[PDB]
Each structure stands twice: as structure tokens, then as C-alpha cells.
Amino acid sequence: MYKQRFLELWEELHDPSNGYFSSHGIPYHAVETLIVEAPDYGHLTTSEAMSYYLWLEALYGKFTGDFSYFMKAWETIEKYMIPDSTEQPGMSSYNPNSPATYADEYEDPSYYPSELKFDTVRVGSDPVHNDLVSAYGPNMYLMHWLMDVDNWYGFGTGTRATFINTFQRGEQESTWETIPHPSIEEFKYGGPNGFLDLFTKDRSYAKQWRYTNAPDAEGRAIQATYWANQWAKEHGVNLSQYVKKASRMGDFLRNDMFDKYFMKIGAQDKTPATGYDSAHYLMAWYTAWGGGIGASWAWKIGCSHAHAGYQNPMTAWILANDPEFKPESPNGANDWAKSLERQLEFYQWLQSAEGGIAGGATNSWNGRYEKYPAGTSTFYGMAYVPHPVYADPGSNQWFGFQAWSMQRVMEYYLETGDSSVKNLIKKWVDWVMSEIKLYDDGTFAIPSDLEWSGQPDTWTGTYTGNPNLHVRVTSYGTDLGVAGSLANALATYAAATERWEGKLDTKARDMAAELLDRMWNLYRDDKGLSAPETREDYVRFFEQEVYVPQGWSGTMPNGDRIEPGVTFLDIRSKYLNDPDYPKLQQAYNEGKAPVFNYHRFWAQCDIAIANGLYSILF
């Protein structure tokens, strides 16, 4: 009965009338155009959406033996999400001795743009580019996270899709303070010098192309390809070309395993590092590579910050201990072997007294490689931060990250019966069981907001229990994507304990089944599943000054004046034509919060994927 739900939500996702997919076959972020999450528009696409797309037709191929949709998903990714060779000019001019130039991070968007340092700070060295080039070539086989499917912002020509970038101005820049700009800059729109002068301060500005990745998306893509390959080998389908595609994606993913400027990890300073002395062996927040248009130069950067919700032990295991997925470069397997162990120790370190996995670590304090304050705990020299990268809404305030990271940890536990991380998994499961509030009716409420206090003990190879690190739940909600992720994690717990422990843990499996059944029964919809959201933050929709720097004037392609004093809506004036705008305006005027029923591609993908993973091995 679970596979029936998976197939019906699959049909609803692939129905052209529901509006989930565009004309090219690219999934949207959500059916509803008026939704402000990490993507500020409903009909943009994200690399996480394409990773969930890959996982969804991997499950479809398992259930039906039809990987044609999975193959087409990979072809769409290569054609649209992975930048093309013609879209990557000047990449052969990269100098691995000098990967990139220095730039600070500032706590407030008002500090931006940031002065660029050319010679005051010495950047380290990149020891993997030469091997990558000798194996494949100059072009990088990585996805760009954000794309404008239907040219809503009008940065391109016609209906053709365009890569876009939003998050550029530090920690306190939320979604409501982003200025969306095209990745491939051609100086056509914006102010003078394109949109470059808003963020990076240079003496001379030139035509550029940029691409940022989200290693969460690549990790999910590699894990989906691994599972698709296993299910195909069970069926008999040959996926060698796409397994090799995922293998080279994983080989290029080793750029994330390094510090942003390739500096010594734990050095507490901007001290340049030699090869492999700058690798913290952890999935960082992002890596960004770019070059010039009409000129011959290129650059690459990693990230110092590591978030526990981005680590994927399963991907590291696959890329280290699988001959089929073995990277062409000889050093790839050893690097992934180191990364797996480092990630597992990271997860063990971060757990709190109750069981909640705290926010990750960083190699740079405040983004400027400053000395840690007195009493700060360290993990291999990396200080502890509760909310890494983003602090305006709280990076680890969201409860979905717990389920997202623990699903990977438990899948690795299921595949490799590693006895090192059993106590972590039991403590986290006990905590989430404690904090779930079911009701005598068919409704439920799971944590949505988390409050963290204290710091974990300094890592010395063993877990002390962290008496000073505490977490409490402050808000209970009914989020469906997080419910799907949590049910997936609990079912993975049940299967892993059945396979690699004395007996199946019926509590986690029963809780996952109860969550799935209650959610599906209560919140079935015409376009999938949804539940009302109070959405208080939408007041910012009418009152959030987006901070255009003073004295900088630009014009959006539709004609909006991007000037100081502009709010969220002023530079997105095509929202006034949205069908849901009158209801939003009425709710804002009369005072009460606007209630929304949102159908996200990734939320329904989580619901269906969790359903299928509950069907699998049961």
C-alpha cells in the first residue's frame, strides 16, 4: 500500500497540469509562485530539486525497472544544471598554485561591498586540480544550485533558462535582503559594471561567469546514483555511463573538502597551507568556480564553515570503498577514506546532552580567521559555532537539518555496520521520540524551532557526554517535508537495527508509520500534500528594506528601479500580477498573518521518497 502512494504522488508530480515541471522538463521549486524560502520565487529551480528528481526516478526504476526517466534526468542535469563546455570559457587558464584571491566576511550586509585583497593575504595551494585535469579536463562536473527556468527575472533572451545567484552578502542577509543577479554576467542589466559592484569591490570590472554549488545536492545525487546502480544491477540494466558521471562528480566534489583559501585547518590564522594541509575532510557549505568572458583566467574557492546538516557519510563511503565508483584520479579513494572518518567523528562531537546534533564547526572565526574566544571548544582545531554561515533566521534553528543529516548517518550505518556511531544514533532517536507530540486525534506536531545553549567538550578522540550542551524545543508545527525526512530516518533506524543488531527496534518503525499515515490521511490535496502555514515573516514582504548600497543605481530587466530604500516587493514588481497577491495584501492590511498552502517539489519528493524507503526492505 506504500508503493501505491509513491506511484500516485509520482503521477501527480509528472502531471503537466499541476505545474511542477516546465516545458524543458525542469522541476520547479514549488507550484505556487508566491513563496519566499531560500529560493525567493516559486518557479525557480534548485540543485536540491534535481537531486530529489534523481532519487525519485531512481526509486521509479527500482519499482518498475524503467530507468529511462532516470537517464533523462541525468541528461537534463548535464544539459541544464551542469554548465556546458561552451558555457565554461577560460577554465584552462587556472593556476593551481594560486587558486583565488582573498576576501573577508562581514557580520552585517551594510558592510558590503567588501574590499578585495590582492597581495596582503597569501592564499594556499590546491593539490587536486592537476589530478582532476589529467583525468578529465579543465571543465568542472558540478552543478550550479540556482536557475531561473522561465526567465522570470528577464536576465536572458526569450524563455531560455538562466543561472542566477542570490546569497552573496554574509550572515545577516536573509532571503528578503537578497538582490537576484545572473551568474553569467554580460553587463546588460543592473547598474554600471553589472551587478558585480554590489558585492565584490574591485578597481576594474570585467565580464565574468560564476558558478556556486551546494555539496548537499551533489552528495544526494551521488547517493541516488549509487542506489540506482544497485537496483539496476538487481534488474539487469546497465548504467555504466551514468555511474561514471556520478564518479567524476564525486571526484570533483573533493574541492569542498578544503578550506576556502586553502589554509591550515586549526591554525587560527590566515597561514597558507601546502597540499592536503588545508583539507578538513568535511563537506563545507559551498564551492565556487568562475572565469572571465572574452579573457583567459579562472578561480576556485571552497568554504571554511562546516554544517552538520551538509555532511554525507554515505557518499564518502561510496566514493572510497566501491570499485565501480572509484575516481579516475589515484588519490580520490584515499581522500574519501579520510573524509568518512572525519565526518563520523564530527557527528559524534556535536551531539548534546539531550541528543540534539548542534551546529557545525568553522576554520575561520567570524569569517576573518580571528583567534577563538576564551573557553571555545575545538574539533581538530576548528572552533564550535551554534549557527554557521546564516544567522538571521538561525542556521540550526530549523529542525529539518537533524532529519536530513541523520538519514545519511543511518543509511551509512545500514550499509556499513560501523559500531563506532551506535550511541550517537540511539541518543538522537531517544531525543526525537521525547520531543514528538502526538495527539489523540489524527493530528500531530513536531519541533520546528530549536533553542541551543552551551558548548560541547573539546574533542580528544572520545565522547564525554557534553554536560554543558543543551537543546530545547520552542515551537511545534506540522511541516510535511520534515515529517517525511524524519520518518525516513526512523525507518532507516529500524532496518539498520534489524540487520546489524540483536532485534528490530519497533518503536522507531511504528513512529515512522504513524507519522506517514496521519500526514497522508489529514493533508491529502489536489496537487499533492500541504498544510496551512501561519507565515508571520511575510510582513517583511511589505517592510524589508533590501539594502541597496547608497549611490548605486540599477534597473531590473522589467524596469524596476533598484535604489537605496527599496523594499522586497519594489524590485520584484511582477509579484503584483500574482494570483495570491490580493489575499496577501488583504491579510496584511487587516492585521492577521497570511495563511498559505504550499506545494514544494522537494517536500513532496521527501514524502514519496520516505514512503518508498518505508516500502523497501519491508
Per-position b or e across 126-139, b if 16+ CB within 10 A of its CB: bbbbebbbeebebb
Q: State how far the Cα of 276 lies from the Cα of 220, in Å rounded to an integer.
A: 25
Amino acid at site 192: P
Strands 181-182, 378-379: pairing is unpaired
- The Cα 101–Cα 124 span in angstroms is 10
The grid coordinates of residue 194 equal 553589472
Residue 200, all three cell numbers = 565584490
Rounded to whole angstroms, how far apart are CA atoms 512 and 486?
Answer: 7
Instruction: Tell which residue, 431, 594, 614, 595, has the closest CA to residue 519.
Output: 614
Nearest partner of 274 among 381, 103, 127, judged by Cα: 127
- Of 402, 419, 607, residue with least CA distance to 520: 607
d(CA 258, CA 281): 7
Q: Which three cell numbers stand for residue 301?
A: 574557492
Which cell goes with 182?
A: 545572473
The 8-class DSSP code of residue 496 comes to H
What are phi and psi for residue 163, nearest 5 degrees? -75, 140
Crossing angle (nearest 10°) for helices 240-252 and 215-235? 160
* 8 Å CB contact between 495 and 612: no
Phi then psi for residue 229, to 5 deg, are -65, -40
- CA–CA gap between residue 75 and residue 413 (Å, rounded): 31
Q: How far apart are CA 315 and CA 575, in angstroms?
A: 40
Q: On the CB side of 615, how many CA atoms lie within 13 Å of its CA?
A: 17
Which of 252, 256, 235, 255 shows the shortest CA–CA distance to 244? 252
d(C-alpha 381, C-alpha 459), whole Å? 9
* Rounded distance between C-alpha atoms, residue 144 and residue 164, angstroms: 9
Task: Note if the bond before 113 is cis, omega within 30 degrees.
Answer: yes
Q: Are the CB atoms for 462 and 456 separated by under 8 Å?
A: no
Residue 543 grid cell: 517592510
Would you say the C-alpha torsion 322, 326, 331, 335 has a positive or negative sign?
negative
Continuous H helices in 178-331: 196-199, 215-235, 240-252, 313-320
Alpha carbons 170 and 177: distance in angstroms, whole number: 11
The resolution in angstroms reads: 2.8
Report the DSSP beta bridge partners of residue 532. 597
- Single-letter amino acid code for the residue at 119: D
Q: Is the dihedral of CA 515, 390, 292, 153 positive or negative?
A: positive
Residues in the chain: 618
Q: Which residues are catalytic?
A: 48, 216
Cβ atoms of 273 and 125 within 8 Å: the answer is yes
Task: Tell me the residue type at 202.
Answer: D
Among 517, 538, 541, 520, CA closest to 529: 520
At 566, the amino acid letter reads V
Strands 181-182 vs 162-165: parallel, antiparallel or unpaired: antiparallel
Residue 115, sorted as left (phi over 0), alpha (psi -120 to 50) or beta, turns out to be beta
Taking the C-alpha atoms of residue 136 and residue 150, their distance in angstroms, rounded to an integer, is 32
Compute and round to an integer the Cα radius of gyration of the chain.
23
Coil, helix or strand for 209? strand
Task: Give strand pairing partners of 404.
Answer: none
How far is residue 370's CA from residue 455's CA, in Å, rounded to a whole number? Answer: 19
Which candidate, 253, 240, 215, 224, places its Cα nearest to that of 70?
224
Count Cβ atoms within 10 A of the Cβ of residue 324 and give its class: 0-12 exposed, 13-18 middle, 19 or more buried.
middle
- How far is it, in rounded angstroms, from Cα 425 to Cα 431? 10
Q: Which residues of 91-101 are buried (b: 16+ CB within 10 A; e: fewer)?
A: beebebeebbb
380 vs 348: CA distance, rounded Å: 13
Best CA proximity match to 153, nearest among 166, 140, 139, 167: 166
Q: What is the DSSP string of 269-282?
A: S--B--TTSSB--S
| Cell numbers for 11 | 503521477
Check: CB of residue 190 under 8 Å from CB of residue 554. Answer: yes
- What is the assigned CATH class of domain 2-534+595-615? mainly alpha
Cα 537–chain centre separation: 22
Closest CA to 140 of 53, 222, 257, 250: 250
What is residue 181's three-state secondary structure? strand
Q: How far, in Å, CA of 599 to CA of 529, rounded?
A: 7
Which residues sit opposite 190 in a β-bridge? Answer: 555
Work out the number of other CB atoms within 10 angstroms of the CB of residue 298: 23
Contacts 24+ apart (CB under 8 A), 186-189: 186/293, 188/155, 189/154, 189/155, 189/554, 189/555, 189/556, 189/557
Backbone angles phi, psi at 97, to 5 degrees: -70, -40
Q: Which sign does the torsion angle of CA 461, 467, 469, 473 carry?
A: positive
As a whole number of angstroms, the distance between CA 88 and CA 483 comes to 39
489 exposure class (CB count in 10 Å sphere: 0-12, 13-18, 19+) = buried
Checking the chain for breaks where C and the next N are over 2.5 Å apart, the residues before them are none
Are 392 and 540 spatial neighbours (Cβ–Cβ below 8 Å)?
no
Runs of H (alpha helix) within 452-580:
480-500, 506-522, 540-543
Amino acid sitting at position 260? K
Q: How far is CA 342 from the centre of its chain?
A: 20
Name the β-bridge partners of 382. Answer: 379
70: helix, coil or strand? Answer: helix
In whole angstroms, give the CA distance from residue 415 to residue 543. Answer: 49
Q: Find out whether the peptide bond into 456 is cis, omega within 30 degrees of 0.
A: no
Please answer whether residues 222 and 313 qualify as being in contact, where contact means their C-beta atoms are separated by less than 8 angstroms. no
SS3 for 344-379, per residue? HHHHHHHECCCCCECCCEECCHHHCCCCCCCCCCEE
Q: Is residue 64 classed as helix, strand or coil in its secondary structure?
A: helix
CB atoms within 10 A of CB 214: 24
Whether 485 contacts 610, CB under 8 Å: yes
- What is the Cα–Cα distance from 481 to 396, expressed in whole angstroms? 16
Cα–Cα distance for residue pair 599/525, rounded to 1 Å: 9
* C-alpha span between 477 and 399 (Å, rounded): 10
- Residue located via cell numbers 582532476: 132
Three-state DSSP string of 419-449: HHHHHHHHHHHHHHHHHCEECCCCCEEEEEE
Q: What count of other Cβ atoms lies within 10 Å of the Cβ of residue 4?
A: 10
